[PDB]
Ligand binder design. Structure first.
Ligand SMILES: [Cl-]
Ligand SMILES: [Cl-]
Ligand SMILES: [Cl-]
Ligand SMILES: [Cl-]
Lengths: 450, 450, 449, 450
C-alpha cells in the first residue's frame, strides 16, 4: 500500500481552458523536453542518485540520538527548509508540544533558520540544554546566520559546563570550510553535505534525514518514494513522466506571459513543502545570464497559498486579476485525524451534519479549481492519498527533476545562485568583517516621512 | 515614547535606481492622489472612524474573559488573519506554550482558520474545554468553514455537558445572518462586526480586539496608533502622507509593469502582518470590472517574504529575474529579547563576537536593500522602533488607507469581492446543499499521470 | 524576644581543675573594661546598625517579588553571612519546597567558590528568567566573584535577558570595578558600607537582601543585634557577654588553649559556626601587633556539630591534648518537634514518646559534663529557638567579642594582610597584566606517583 | 584510564620550607615506620582485606533495591559519614534534586546522622515512604541516635500500613546486639558490619557499599582502587609508600609542635571525604593512654577546610598565626562539568575570559600553597585526576593505612575509643534509662548571664 502521486494536468489544456495549451504547443517543445530527460539520464545530477551512505551515515547515529529529547537544527535556506518541510508534513502539528510518551520516545525538532532573536529566544525557552542536540548545518561551513546561532548555542553549553561534543552534531562539506576544520580540530561528530549537491537540492541527503530520523520519520520509505519518482522522471515517454510534464507546461506558459507559479496546498501540514518549492523554483530558475553569458533575466515567481484559508485572501485576485499565474493544487485525500462534523439540529447546517471535516476541505479545493477553470486560469493538481514519507519523498524527487528540466529548457544553469553574493558582501562590510570594504554612498534623492 | 513609523521611499526614485520614478511621474498623478485623500476625508469609510464602541464593547467582557485560560477563534480570512497578526506581532512566539504565570494571567489564543482536520485536531489536543472560550466570528453569519468548526466545538461542549453559552462568544452582523439568529434564540453573548466594515478591514473592530485583549494586548494603544496614522493619511500634503505615497508609487509602478508587491518583514513575529497585507491588497485591488463596468482585470500580486530567511530562498530571483516587483521592507530596530552573540575565541568569527544578534539581522536587511538598489529593483522601507501596539495600529491604518487610495486611483471598488462567489456555489453543490445545483461537466481532454 | 543565655561556669575553678580563678579575672578586668570603653567611645561602624541598611534593602521589596530565586555570587565576608542566615532562619529543605510552601518568598542559593561542580549544580536548579543574581564584593574586583559574575552575565546575554533585570550589585559606594559597572550600565545596587569589613558585614545590606528575599524578618534581626550591642557596652563585665567571652578566651589563649571549638547542637546552626570561624580566624590571626612587633597571634576556630561529632571528635576533645576551649550552642525549642514513637520494645523504653529533641539536649548535657569531668574548659550559649532576634544577638555578641579580643591582644582585628601574597601568585599564574611572581623550581622534590 | 593518586610531599621538607623536615629527621623514624608497614603486612587488620563478601552481599540485593527511589541511611559517625563521603564525592551535588530519569533509574540517598528534628523532618518532607528503603546501620546494634530515628521510621511505616520488612534493611554485627535480634525475630533483610572492622574503618564494607550501589556508584571500582592503594601501603620502600610517608611526616611534625592537621579540599564534592578523615584521625589518634597504660594524652586535631572558599576565612590565620599546622591539599584536576568563563568585553576581566572556571580554582590552590611555603608553613598535596570511584577508593585505603601506621608510631591503640563512653552514660541517665544512675551535681561556682 504505497501509491504513486496522481497528476492531473487537464486544466492546463485547451479546451478545458479557453487560452489553454494545445497539441501544437506540446509538439513545439517535446524534443527539447525529451532531451532534458535524456541529459538527466546520461549526466545524472548527484541529488538524484540517493546514495545509500546518506541513510546509512544517519542511521549510524541512531543509538546516540536517543540520548536527546530535542534536536535543534541551526541551518538556513537549503539547510533549514527541508527540515521544516519534513517535520510539518510528516508529524502532527502539535508534535513539539506532545509529551515524550505521546512521541513514542522520539525527539522534538526545532529549526532556527533566521537571526531574529525573538525566534532563537523562543526556542531556547523551550529546551533543556542537557537533553538537546544542536545540528549545525552549512554546506560552505561559514554561513553568517549559522555561525551566529552556533556561537550562541556553544556559548550556552560552555557557560553550563556541558561538553560541546556531547551536544552538537556538525553537517558540512567533507573537506572545505570553517565547520569542517572545527570538526577536525575539536573532534565533533559530523555528517556530510555531499560535495555535488547544492543546498536547495539537499533535503534527502543527511541535511534533512538526521532531524527526520530523530523525530521518528521512516527515512527509508522517504528514499523509496524518491527512488520511484526519479525512475518515472527518466521516462522518455513524456505522458508517463510527471516531472517532464511540469517542466513542459510551465516552460510553455512562462513563454505566454505566466510569470507566477502558485502552489496551493490544501493542508496546513503541507505548507512547508510549498516553502521548499519556493526556494527550489525561485533560486534555480531566477537567473540574469543564460549558459552562453547572454542577459536573459529569466524566472517564474513562486507564490505560496494554503487552501481553504487563502480562498478568503487570494482567490478574488486569482480569478479576476491579471491572467499571469499557473496554479498547482496539492490535494491530500486522507487525514490522520478524521474529525466528523456533528449534527447540530439546525436545518441551516444539514449540508455539513455528520460529514467528515475533510469532505468540506476537499469540496472546497474542487470548487476553487473549477471556478478557476471557468475563469480560464490554468491549473493542475497533485493528489496524495495521505501524508506519508513515500508520498513526500516522491514530491521532493519529482520537483527536483522538474526544476532540473526547466533549467535545460531555459538554457540556464539551475544549480548556481550568483545573485546572492552582493548583499552578503555589503552586510559583511557593515559588520566590520576583515577584507570587506563596500561603502554605501550618501543618496542624492532622499524621500522620507518620519 | 510613542513614535511614528518611519517611511523611506528613496529607493523607489531616480537616480537611486536607474529606471526609477521621476518628478514627472509624481506630477502625472499628484492631483488624482490628492483627490483620493480628499474623498477619504469627505466620505470616510467606516473602518477609519475607530468607533469607541469597538473598544468599549470588548472591555465590557473583560471580567468574564478572565474565567478562561484559552480563547480559540473560529474565523477565516478577514475574521482570522487579523487575530493571528495581532497575536504574533504583539506577544512572544512561545506565548501559547508559556505557563499561566508567565502569561501574567492572560489567555492563550489559538486561531482555527481552515477546515483541515489536522489543524483543528491539534488545537483541540491542546485545550481544556472547561476553561476555553470559542469566539465564533463571521460577518455574514454563515461562512461554511466557520459553521463547520462551530459545529465541532458545540458538539464537544454538548457531549461534555458544558453550557454553550458559557463557552462561546459570537461576533457577527448586528441584524442579519444565521449566527445572529442563534444569538437571539439561545442567548449567547455577542459582539458586532460593524455593518459598514468589510472583513479584511475589520482587525481593529471587535473582530480583532477581543482575542487581543484576552491575551493582554493594550487595545487602547492599538487604536491610538491607528488614530494618529489615519490623521496623517488625511494630509493633502502627499510628502507628509505615508498612505498617499504608498498608493502614488505603487500605482505608478503597476502602470510600468511592476505586477508584484513583495512585503519582506525582518522579523518572525511580523510574518502574519504580511499575510494580513496579502489579503488586503489582493482581495481589494484584484478586480475584473472597474466602477464603470468595463473589464480591466486589474491587480498587483502581494508576495510574502521573511528576512533574513528568504535571502536564502527568493533574493536570487529578486535581484536577477524579471524586474516585475516593488519590494517593501519592514524593519524593526529593537527586540524584546536582545541576544548577544558570544565570543567563541575563533578568529574567523570575530566579526560576530559580542554583537547583538539583531545587529546581524539589521545588517542583512541593509545589505539586501542596497544590493537590490544596485540591481535597480525598486524598494522602500517601513521602520518600527519596536513591536508595540502603537506601531502595529499605525501599520494597519496606513495600509488600510493606502489600499483605499489605490482603489480610487485604479477607479475600482476596493471594498467588494465578487470573484469568490463562484467557487462557493460549486462547493455547496458538491456538499449537497439545498438549492445549489451546479454540475461539473465531464472533460473532453483528460491529461493524467496516475 | 528573650536574651541569649550564657553559662561560663565550666570555664572556672573549681568546676574544672585547672580552671580560671578570681585572680585570673582580676589580672585582666581593667584591660577588658578599657576594651569596652574604647568600643563605647570609638564605636566601629558595624555596631551602629544604620537605619539605611534596612531601608535600602526594603526599597527593593516590590522588585524582588518578580523573582523566585536569588543566587548570591559572593565569597567569604560576602557569602558566609548569607548562608548563616539562610540555614539558621529557614528550614533545611527551603530551596526544595514549592513556592506555595515558601509563602511566595524566594529560594536562596550561595555560590561562594569557583568549583564548577558548585556553580553547575546551582545553574541546573534555576530558571534564568525568574532568577536574581546578587553580585557582592566590597572591593568590587574579588576574582572569584568576577568569574561567577561573568558566567551569569554570559548566560543572561545568550538568552537575551537584560542583565539590569536580573542582577543586583552590592559593592563599595565609590571605588572599584563593580561600582563602575553600576554607574556605566545603570544597575540597581546596594552598598557595602565603607567602614565595614566583609567579615563584619552580615547585618549590612550584604546579608539583609537575600534574607529579606526569603522572608526573614530583618527588622527583628537588627532588634536583637541592637540589644546585644547595648549589653556589650556595659562596663560591668558580669552583665556583658561579649566582654566575658573575650576575657575568658584571652586568659586561656595565654594558658595554652590554642583552639576554640564551637559546637552547635543543630544542623541549622552549622553556618553560624562557619561565620564565626572566619570572624575569629581572620581577625585575631595576626603576624604583627599594633607596634609592628612580630607576635604570630591567633586561636584556631574549630567547627563541630552535636550530636553528630560526638562520634567523630569527642574522643579527642576528652582524651587528647588539653588545648581547646569549647563553646556549645544549644537550642531548646525546634520548629518541628518530632515525637519518638513507642515501638513496643523494652530495650527502647527510655526513648518511647519523648521528643527527639529531648535526646539531642540530653546528649549536649552529657557531652558537656563528661568534658568538665575530664577538666576540659567549656561554656554554653543557649537559644530559646531559631529566631531572627536570637540570631541577630549572636552575630552582635561575637562581633563585639572579637573586637575586644583584638584590643586585649593589642592587634588590629579589622585587617587581613596575610591573604595578599596568595592572590598575587594566583594572578600571576592567571596571566593578569602586571602580576609577575614566578614560582621557582624546587631543589628537594619528594613525590610518589 | 585508572591512575594512582599523586602525592607531593615536597613542601614538608627543607629547604622548601625553612624549619622543614630533614634527611636526619627521616632517618630518625625510618626503621619504626618500616616496622609499622611490616606489622600491617604480617598482622593485617580486617579492614584492609576487602573481603569479596562485602561486595557480593550488597550486589545480591540489587534487584530488590531497584524497587525504591530513595534510600535513607539511618546511621551516625562510622555508620553515616562514609555514606555521605561517597555520595558527595561520586555523584553530582544536585543528585537528590534530579529527576529519576536524570539519575538513570538509580536512587536518591539521604543520610540522617543526627537527632536534630529539623534534619529528620526535612528528609521526611522529601520522601514517599512507599518508595523508600531505610538502611538502619549500627555495629553495636543499639546506638541511641539510630534507635531513635529507627523508631520514627518504623512508626511512620506502621501508621501507613506498610510492612517494615519491605522498607527497612538492617546492617549490624552478625551475632550481637538489639538490631541483630530484631532481624532474627522479625525476619528483616540484613547486611553485616564485619566483627573485626570498627565503624570509622567501615566505609568500604557493606556499611558504605549499599547506599553507594543504590545511587549507581561502581563499587567494584571503589574496591579496585582501595586494593591497589593497600598494596602500595605494604611496600617497605617508604619512598614508594604514600601511607608510610603520611604517617612518617605527620608523626615527626606532631613531635615538633604541629598539633593540627588541616585537610583542605579544592572541591565542594570532596568536603565529606574531609569529614570522614576528621573522624578517622581524631578518634583513632586522640588517646589518653598508650599501649603500656601510661598517660600520654596524644593526638593531632584534624581541621576541615575547603578551597578556594576558606582562602577568605582561614588563610590569614594559616599564614600569619601560630605555626602549629601541617596542611594537606586535595586537588582534583578534571571536573565533570567544565564551565568556561565567558568573555565579558571588559578589559579588567581579560585574565579570566574564556578560561575554564577550574583553571582559576587550580591557580588558587597553587598560589595558596606557594604563599604558605613562602611563609614556612609545611604542606603537601594529594592530586586526583578526577572524582572517580577508583580515586576515592585509593583515598580511603591510603588514609586508613596511614592512621594504622600513626597509631604504631605513637604506640597507642588506633582502633578503640574509650573517651566516648562517659558522655553516653550521663546521657542515658538523663534519659531515665534503666541501670544508668549518674547524677550531675549542683555547682559551687555558677557564672551565668541571662
Ligand atoms: Cl507569497
Ligand atoms: Cl521598583
Ligand atoms: Cl537476607
Ligand atoms: Cl574544623
Amino acid at each position: 500500500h504505497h501509491m504513486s502521486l496522481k497528476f492531473d494536468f487537464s486544466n492546463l489544456f485547451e479546451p478545458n481552458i479557453s487560452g489553454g495549451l494545445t497539441d501544437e504547443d506540446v509538439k513545439s517543445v517535446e524534443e527539447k523536453v525529451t532531451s532534458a530527460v535524456r541529459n538527466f539520464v546520461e549526466n545524472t545530477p548527484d541529488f538524484a542518485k540517493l546514495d545509500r551512505s546518506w541513510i546509512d551515515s544517519v542511521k549510524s547515529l541512531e543509538d546516540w540520538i536517543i540520548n536527546f529529547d530535542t534536536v535543534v537544527v541551526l541551518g538556513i535556506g537549503g539547510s533549514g527548509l527541508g527540515n521544516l518541510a519534513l517535520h510539518y508534513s510528516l508529524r502532527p502539528l502539535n508534535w513539539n508540544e506532545m509529551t515524550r510518551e505521546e512521541r513514542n520516545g522520539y525527539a522534538r525538532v526545532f529549526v532556527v533558520d533566521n537571526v531574529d532573536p525573538d525566534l532563537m529566544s523562543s526556542v531556547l525557552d523551550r529546551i533543556d540544554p542537557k537533553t538537546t542536540l544542536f545540528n549545525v548545518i552549512s554546506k560552505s561551513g561559514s554561513t553568517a546566520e549559522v555561525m551566529a546561532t552556533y556561537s550562541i548555542a556553544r556559548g550556552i553549553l560552555e557557560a553550563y559546563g556541558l561538553d560541546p561534543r556531547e551536544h552538537m552534531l556538525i553537517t558540512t562539506d567533507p573537506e572545505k570550510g570553517f565547520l569542517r576544520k572545527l570538526v577536525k580540530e575539536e573532534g565533533f561528530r559530523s555528517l556530510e553535505v555531499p560535495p555535488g549537491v547544492g543546498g536547495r537540492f539537499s533535503v534527502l541527503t543527511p541535511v534533512g534525514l538526521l532531524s527526520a530520523m530523530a523525530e521518528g520519520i521512516d527515512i527509508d520509505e522517504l528514499h523509496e518514494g524518491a527512488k520511484d519518482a526519479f525512475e518515472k522522471s527518466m521516462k522518455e515517454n513524456i505522458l508517463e513522466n510527471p516531472a517532464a510534464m511540469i517542466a513542459l507546461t510551465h516552460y510553455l506558459y512562462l513563454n505566454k506571459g505566466k510569470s507566477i507559479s502558485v502552489m496551493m496546498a490544501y493542508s496546513n501540514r503541507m505548507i512547508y513543502l510549498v516553502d521548499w518549492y519556493r526556494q527550489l523554483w525561485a533560486e534555480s530558475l531566477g537567473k540574469r545570464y543564460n549558459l552562453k553569458g547572454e542577459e536573459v533575466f529569466t524566472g517564474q515567481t513562486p507564490v505560496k497559498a494554503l487552501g481553504a484559508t487563502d480562498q478568503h485572501s487570494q482567490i478574488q485576485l486569482y480569478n479576476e486579476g491579471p491572467n499571469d499565474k499557473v496554479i498547482t493544487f496539492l490535494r491530500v485525500e486522507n487525514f490522520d485525524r478524521e474529525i466528523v462534523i456533528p449534527e447540530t439540529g439546525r436545518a441551516e447546517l444539514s449540508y455539513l451534519a455528520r460529514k467528515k471535516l475533510s469532505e468540506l476541505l476537499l469540496a472546497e479545493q474542487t470548487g476553487t479549481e473549477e471556478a478557476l477553470r471557468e475563469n480560464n486560469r490554468p491549473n493542475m493538481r497533485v493528489t496524495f492519498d495521505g501524508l506519508t514519507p513515500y508520498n513526500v519523498g516522491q514530491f521532493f524527487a519529482y520537483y527536483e527533476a522538474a526544476t532540473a528540466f526547466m533549467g535545460y529548457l531555459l538554457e540556464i544553469n539551475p544549480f548556481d545562485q550568483p545573485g546572492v553574493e552582493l548583499g552578503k558582501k555589503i552586510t559583511f562590510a557593515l559588520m566590520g568583517r576583515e577584507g570587506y570594504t563596500y561603502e554605501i554612498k550618501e543618496r542624492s534623492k532622499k524621500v522620507i516621512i518620519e
